[PDB]
Amino acid sequence: VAGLNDTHAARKTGAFQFLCAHGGLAGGVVDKTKNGPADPDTGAVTVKVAQ
């Protein structure tokens, strides 16, 4: 699984959104609602559709 020197996506880096929430990782943060599944312990719900 180590060969294929050419058949490989170049690279990618975790950006601001992936570091902040990375809600679903759908090839670009899709901002429909993604408020938060449960966040039981604390808050940190800094993702909203801006109603």
Partner: protein, 49 residues
Amino acid sequence: NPTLFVSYDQNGKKLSFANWISVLSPQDTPFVSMTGKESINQTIFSWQT
């Protein structure tokens, strides 16, 4: 011995780790840290008004 320079050429990496922990939610309380505490050895304290 540089042979592949893909995954296993340089083993013993740092795993993309840094020596600093990030608490995403602010949980500091500067109030008490500002208000300095004073020591009392005995237990017969008394103050005046």
